[PDB]
From a paper:
Volume-regulated anion channels (VRACs) participate in the cellular response to osmotic swelling. VRACs are composed of proteins belonging to the conserved LRRC8 family, whose expression is restricted to chordates. This family contains five members in humans, termed LRRC8A–E. All of them share a close sequence relationship and consist of an N-terminal pore domain (PD) followed by a cytoplasmic leucine-rich repeat domain (LRRD).
However, the LRRDs have rearranged compared to the interactions in the LRRC8A/C/Sb1 complex (by rigid body rotations of 16°, 9°, 11° and 10° for the respective positions A1–A4), leading to a weakening of the tight interface and the creation of a gap between interacting domain pairs. The described movements of the LRRDs of the four A subunits have expanded the accessible space for the respective regions of the adjacent C subunits, as manifested in the emergence of density of the LRRD of the subunit in the C1 position and of the CSD of the less-well-defined C2 position. It instead resembles the arrangement in the LRRC8C heptamer, except for a rigid body rotation by 17° away from the pore axis around a pivot that is located at the interface to the PD. Considering the observed symmetry mismatch, the incorporation of C subunits and potentially also other LRRC8 homologs into heteromeric channels would perturb the tight interactions found in A homomers and thus destabilize the closed state and improve the activation properties.
Author numbering:
A (entry chain E): 16 to 59, 95 to 176, 236 to 527, 531 to 804
B (entry chain D): 241 to 808
C (entry chain F): 16 to 59, 95 to 176, 236 to 409
The structure:
């Protein structure tokens, strides 16, 4: 605060200033006490030479000749030196007596002393310091915008140099002007009868010697000033480059500083070369990461991880992470977790401690830039079987995820095309069976063809992008279940016709209207599941009868106005979704759907149901929905296997009691109005609700 | 600890410098020479101060006179002041010359530091360089004791002792209690790994049954290990540890098994031969040496009670001391892990042997000496690259031949002479290229366990009903598409590993498998699961390894009972 | 307490006052030791001019002419400088030397130091101070009813400017009065036989230059006081709105301060804007609620 700001030249200038103050004050004292001029007239066995004058006349003549003959600078030399020394001291102290910048100086001293005093800097170079970190950042945000302190110091040094130069330049000439003796011819004659007077004052030659010594002192002072200014005009203190801390501690942070911080750091280095090293630690970003990680590890407890441990979507022991700055090693102490979920966690570095997480197969990453160690990468390569990744701008995607040979399932949520897919080769994913990607991919990547030799299920569900190139999808020889959603295709592709091993098929949100290519779906005799969700479909060809392999049918949210009879020809269909369409009448041929276990016509104009629909005795799920039904038949009592029933929103008056004859049907599985259910008897409603 | 850290930091910082010494030397030189200069010229000019002076300034136009005699009253006083001051200067110069001469004689750029460490036996007190020795000598001039009061903090032994104290402070018996685990042998294990030193608190948990040490730097066993009654097995991984006599005596009668994993020969303590109650010994790491191989382990003969032996050393010759000590060995295990081994006929001298394992020894053939072991009952020869195994006919010699393993080899055919080997109860020949099962194999009716997975097999002979004692068979990764009815004739079949085959359909006779506990069908090309599979009394979902879609063909009541038994 | 109540102009005035006091002491010492008037009869080969007078007559003539001829201002000038500098120092110290307002000043210094010393202020801007909040509010119940401190300080500044104005006004006229030489005609004839006397005192020109330097210093002091008074009647220190804590920290509390509190905050901002910012943390209702919430989560 008062000592650490002073380089060697500052100390030497201070000592010279004290010496000059002593010189000036002593000269003033001697001028006050002993500086007197003795005068006698000049113009005139030896005897006395009395001029018959008294002592008062002597005194008057001494006064007059002292005023007249004595050189003004000779008389004012003590005051002159005192004034110049006072100016030097005032301008030297004014740097820290200036409160506006002295506040910044004091804050810098406090922060530097506290940072050097902090033991954590020594620990990291090998508690509340983290909080102290905050102040450091605050300081480097507010004080880097200064540098007026540096200009003020430059002004002070310039003024001191100018004063020294002037002092030397004029005192060198003025010293010779003074003499021990002096003479004066004033009109003291006719007042005393003498005009010429030889006089002298004692302090002359002593003053001359003292002045010579003082001028030599000022010369050394100016030499010190010149050395300081040369060091100022040779190093360009506007920027301080460490270039050694980064080399030694390996921390590429502490990049540079502004003009003011460079000035202060250079001054500290001149004062001491190690306090800067101890001070820069709290500016280091990697050191700050180390302190944050250590504090977070100490704060974290494995018990909270055990409590927050849950199951993932795919029935694995998941440990979700919502907001973390790093990896708690306590998480590595939890080896029983089968899933791990990271959400919005940047700068993740997985050490070899992942070897502790032995029983790990699924990893969920949501907007996380995750880097591993080679040991961690190997452990994940031989142990990670499922992976869930969310990326926003591809900047969070780790490359090493393409090297997992034991990975089976992959989840992506993030655009790739940003027209081609920016996908790295899926060559090392030698066990990849399931691939689900959420992007806006335009053309199907070749990388998946690098994995299709063993890949079993590839799915891309874009946000509406139109899939252009269908050549690669023809190569999916080992593909088993294909799901295409919202691909804006508007037509049935030729690639699926080249995929005979397809067992499940999905065309959700593809907005198909003319779907007459089922003849080319007979080319898939394993086409057990085929989906046409969220399409403009209104026409069903006869040739759909040729897919005897059909076992599940989806036609929800379509423009189908009338359903045909031939649609009932595929007897093997067990799931029937005809909801959210324009269906009003159900043709009686639905009676042949004996194995039909699901039938949903929710939100249609269904106004009646033929009795043959109840011939589907294996119907365990019936969802009529808000349709235009007005009456319910007693024959539904024959559905002993009905588990879920939904007829809500219709125009029923009285529900037949035979609904209670459905053993698997409950009140929870029955969706009826309060009045509708009230029409059922007391015993039936009690059995549906409880065991009476 | 922070004091030690700052000591190391300061040693790095200043021991190099040698700056303060140079500046003080320059200052001493300046003081001495300045004293000499003043003592010269002042005494040169002392005489000039005289009370009476005679001046002729030649002022006659103002006075008329020429010469004047004058008196300076203080001249005697100034002479006194000059004499007093120059006497003070002489004293100052004597002091300065003493200082400079002492400094030149001393040569204090390296602190000897050997007397203190020699007296206190603190050998870790190195001589410090310039800018540290000079200050040390100055403080010794002030006070010698202050030197020693710092020497103990340059003592590495002291630093290690302080770190050991901190290590003991950190550990709590509760954390070791939660750190105690149970191995596959139901033995309480406290595996200390990458730990700097022994905290003696671990000696209080006598319930410790197995101690496993890895990457622990050269500790010495204190006598307090005598408190660990339950320790019977020991595992030391890459540690050249020392021991104490009471510890050695306690382990001499309280050690049953020992396991060592060493990268270098010296990591084996030599007092191992003194432990006379050792029964099982495990060694891992290349112990191979040139012209002195099997000589470092010559003390096994002293281990009279040695019974079990596990070797993982990539050896090519059978050790002589091992062969000699095999007289009382009942089991020997060698894992040359790639290196081909020559028995040199020296394997038959251990007739008392009962089990023999040679895994990845690259044998490529069966030496005759193996048959000489009449007490041998089980044998594993995994990864010996065995293509022809027709020698099994000599296995008629072993009347107690209970089990045999020749898996992970080139065996593609089964010699019929195994039909002579009726004594077999288990067999495991997986990871081979076997394509057919001879009927003669079913002549070893004592067979109970089989693992013929990963083979070219495509059928099961009807003679499986002959092997009624069979309870476990694995045929994973084969060409099996048919199941004989006779497969279901063994009603005591407990568990099966039949997954990953080309099996089209499972015969309905699966209900005959009354003891069926676990079944693997994952990967089979099945379509409908037989309903009689759901009537097996010991069936559980855990014991049902099959895909969910194919499993869904089972009746719903079967699924409900399976889930109920899963919850119960 | 004794340091942070001084803006830069206050320290400058302190240095000017010290310089003026030292100069007055130097002049008084010079007058005590060496100030003497020498007198000779005026009205009269060149030889001596003996007037057959003795040393007692010499001293008596010096006495009578110094008492009569020399200007009373010239004689009292070191004393006048000393008196005015002493008045300046007294009025400078009296702002804190009056206990009635000094108690409030001391309490303000202590509470500001305690509040800025609390690290929870930095926590909020990013323990027992919660109880210290009471003192803060107690303090805002006590000193905001003052503002007589501001009136006292304004009186002091006006009096200092008035002193500087009067000093300049009459010292400028009196400076030209001092002369190296002087003459006096008293009825010392028939007591010594002479009436006319030419006289001179050594100090005259040195004291003239001393007066020049003193008047320059008084000019500097007047400039400083003028700047202070102008700043008093331009920024309207009776009200202080932060408009920065509310905007930066997003806290809509801290409505305003009273005349005394606004004046204190203005003076502290003149010394340092950041200490006021750190003290404003505990006037923040939002911060105080956050600290109460933290204490409650700890205690519950």
């Amino acid at each position: 605060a008062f000592r650490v700001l002073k380089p060697w030249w500052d100390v030497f200038t201070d000592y010279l200033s004290v010496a000059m103050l002593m010189i000036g004050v002593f000269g003033c004292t001697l001028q006050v006490m002993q500086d007197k001029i003795i005068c006698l007239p000049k113009r005139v066995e030896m005897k006395g030479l009395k001029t018959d004058l008294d002592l008062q006349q002597y005194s008057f003549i001494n006064q007059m000749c002292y005023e007249r003959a004595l050189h003004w600078y000779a008389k004012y030399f003590p005051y002159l030196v005192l004034i110049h020394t006072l100016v030097f001291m005032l301008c030297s102290n004014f740097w820290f007596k200036f409160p506006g910048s002295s506040s910044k100086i004091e804050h810098f001293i406090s922060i530097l002393g506290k940072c050097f005093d902090s033991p954590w800097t020594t620990r990291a170079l090998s508690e509340q310091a983290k909080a102290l970190f905050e102040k450091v950042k605050k300081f480097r945000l507010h004080v880097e915008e200064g540098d007026i302190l540096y200009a003020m110091y430059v002004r002070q040094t310039v003024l001191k140099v100018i004063k020294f130069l002037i002092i030397i330049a004029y005192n060198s000439a003025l010293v010779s002007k003074v003499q021990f003796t002096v003479d004066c011819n004033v009109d003291i004659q006719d007042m005393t009868g003498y005009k010429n007077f030889s006089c002298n004052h004692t302090m002359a030659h002593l003053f001359s010697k003292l002045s010579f010594c003082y001028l030599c002192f000022v010369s050394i002072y100016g030499l010190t000033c010149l050395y300081t200014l040369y060091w100022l005009f040779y190093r360009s203190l506007r920027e301080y480059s460490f270039e050694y801390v980064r080399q030694e501690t390996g921390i590429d942070d502490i990049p540079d500083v502004k003009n003011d911080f460079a000035f202060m750091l250079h001054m500290i280095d001149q004062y001491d070369p190690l306090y800067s090293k101890r001070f820069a630690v709290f500016l280091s970003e990697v050191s700050e990461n180390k302190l944050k990680q250590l504090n977070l590890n100490n704060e974290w407890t494995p018990d909270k991880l055990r409590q927050k441990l849950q199951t993932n979507a795919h029935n694995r022991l998941e440990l979700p992470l919502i907001m973390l700055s790093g990896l708690p090693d306590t998480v590595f102490e939890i080896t029983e977790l089968q899933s791990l979920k990271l959400e919005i966690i940047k700068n993740v570095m997985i050490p070899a401690t992942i070897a502790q997480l032995d029983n790990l197969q699924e990893l969920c990453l949501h907007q996380c830039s995750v880097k591993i160690h080679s040991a961690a990468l190997s452990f994940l390569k031989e142990n990670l079987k499922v992976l869930s990744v969310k990326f926003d701008d591809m900047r969070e995607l780790p490359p090493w995820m393409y090297g997992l040979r034991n990975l089976e399932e992959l989840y992506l949520v993030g655009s790739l095309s940003h027209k081609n897919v920016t996908l790295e080769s899926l060559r090392d994913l030698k066990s990849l069976k399931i691939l689900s990607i959420k992007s806006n991919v335009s053309k199907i990547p070749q990388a998946v063809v690098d994995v299709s030799s063993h890949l079993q299920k590839m799915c891309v569900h874009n946000d509406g992008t139109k899939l252009v190139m269908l050549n690669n999808l023809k190569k999916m020889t080992n593909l088993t279940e294909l799901e295409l959603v919202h691909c804006d295709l508007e037509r049935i592709p030729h690639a699926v016709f080249s995929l005979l091993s397809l067992q499940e098929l999905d065309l959700k949100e593809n907005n198909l209207k003319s779907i007459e290519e089922i003849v080319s779906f007979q080319h898939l005799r394993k086409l057990t599941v085929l989906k046409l969700w969220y399409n403009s479909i209104a026409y069903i060809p006869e040739h759909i009868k040729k897919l005897t392999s059909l076992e599940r049918l989806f036609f929800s949210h379509n423009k189908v106005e009338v359903l045909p009879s031939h649609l009932f020809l595929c007897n093997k269909i067990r799931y029937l979704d005809l909801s959210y369409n324009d269906i009003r009448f159900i043709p009686p041929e639905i009676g042949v759907l004996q194995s039909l276990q699901y039938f949903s016509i929710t939100c249609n104009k269904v106004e009646s149901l033929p009795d043959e629909l109840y011939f589907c005795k294996k119907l365990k799920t019936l969802k009529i929905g808000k349709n235009s039904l007005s009456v319910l038949s007693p024959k539904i009592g024959n559905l002993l296997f009905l588990s879920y029933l939904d007829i809500k929103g219709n125009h029923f008056e009285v529900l037949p009691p035979e609904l209670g004859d459905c053993r698997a049907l409950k009140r929870a599985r029955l969706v009826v109005e309060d009045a509708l259910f009230e029409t059922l008897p007391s015993d039936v409603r009690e059995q549906m609700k409880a065991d009476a | 600890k922070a004091l030690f850290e700052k000591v190391k930091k300061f040693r790095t910082h200043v021991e190099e410098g040698d700056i303060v010494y140079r500046l003080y030397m320059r200052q001493t030189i300046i003081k001495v020479i300045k004293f000499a200069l003043i003592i010269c010229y002042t005494v040169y000019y002392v005489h000039n101060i005289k009370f009476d002076v005679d001046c002729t300034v030649d002022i006659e136009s103002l006075t008329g006179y020429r010469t004047y005699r004058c008196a300076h009253p203080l001249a005697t006083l100034f002479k006194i002041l000059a004499s007093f001051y120059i006497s003070l200067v002489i004293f100052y110069g004597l002091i300065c010359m003493y200082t400079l001469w002492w400094m030149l004689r001393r040569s204090l750029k390296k602190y000897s530091f050997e007397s203190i460490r020699e007296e206190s036996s603190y050998s870790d007190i190195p001589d410090v360089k310039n800018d540290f020795a000079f200050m040390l000598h100055l403080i010794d001039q002030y006070d010698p004791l202050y030197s020693k009061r710092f020497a103990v903090f340059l003592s590495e032994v002291s630093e290690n002792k302080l770190r050991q104290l901190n290590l003991n402070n950190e550990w709590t018996l509760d954390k070791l209690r939660q750190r105690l685990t149970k191995n596959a042998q139901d033995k309480l294990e406290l595996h200390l790994f990458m730990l700097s030193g022994i905290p003696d608190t671990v000696f209080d948990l006598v319930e410790l049954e197995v101690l496993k040490l890895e990457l622990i730097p050269d500790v010495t066993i204190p006598p307090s290990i005598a408190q660990l009654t339950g320790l019977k097995e020991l595992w030391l991984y890459h540690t050249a540890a020392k021991i104490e006599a009471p510890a050695l005596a306690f382990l001499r009668e309280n050690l049953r098994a020992l396991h060592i994993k060493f990268t270098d020969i010296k990591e084996i303590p030599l007092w191992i031969y003194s432990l006379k109650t050792l029964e099982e010994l495990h060694l891992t790491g290349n112990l191979s040496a040139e012209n002195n191989r099997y000589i470092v382990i010559d003390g096994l003969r002293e281990l009279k009670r040695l019974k079990v032996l596990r070797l993982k050393s990539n050896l090519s010759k059978l050790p002589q001391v091992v062969t000699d000590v095999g007289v009382h060995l009942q089991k020997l295990s060698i894992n040359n892990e790639g290196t081909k081994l020559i028995v040199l006929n020296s394997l038959k001298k251990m007739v008392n042997l009962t089990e023999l394992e040679l895994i990845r020894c690259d044998l490529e053939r069966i030496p005759h000496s193996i048959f000489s072991l009449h007490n041998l009952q089980e044998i594993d020869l995994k990864d010996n690259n065995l293509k022809t195994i027709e020698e099994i006919i000599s296995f008629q010699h072993l009347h107690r031949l209970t089990c045999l393993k020749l898996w992970y080899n080139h065996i593609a055919y089964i010699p019929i002479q195994i039909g002579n080997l009726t004594n077999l109860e288990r067999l495991y020949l997986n990871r081979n290229k076997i394509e057919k099962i001879p009927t003669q194999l079913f002549y070893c009716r004592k067979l109970r366990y089989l693992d013929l997975s990963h083979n070219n097999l495509t059928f099961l002979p009807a003679d499986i009903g002959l092997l009624q004692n069979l309870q476990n068979l694995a045929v994973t990764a084969n060409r099996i598409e048919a199941l004989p009815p006779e497969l279901f004739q063994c009603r005591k079949l407990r568990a099966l590993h039949l997954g990953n085959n080309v099996l089209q359909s499972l015969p309905s006779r699966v209900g005959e498998l009354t003891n069926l506990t676990q079944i693997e069908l994952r990967g089979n090309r099945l379509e409908c699961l037989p309903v009689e599979l759901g009537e097996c009394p010991l069936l559980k979902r855990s014991g049902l390894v099959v895909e969910e879609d194919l499993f869904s063909t089972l009746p719903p009541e079967v699924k409900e009972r399976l889930w109920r038994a899963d919850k119960e």
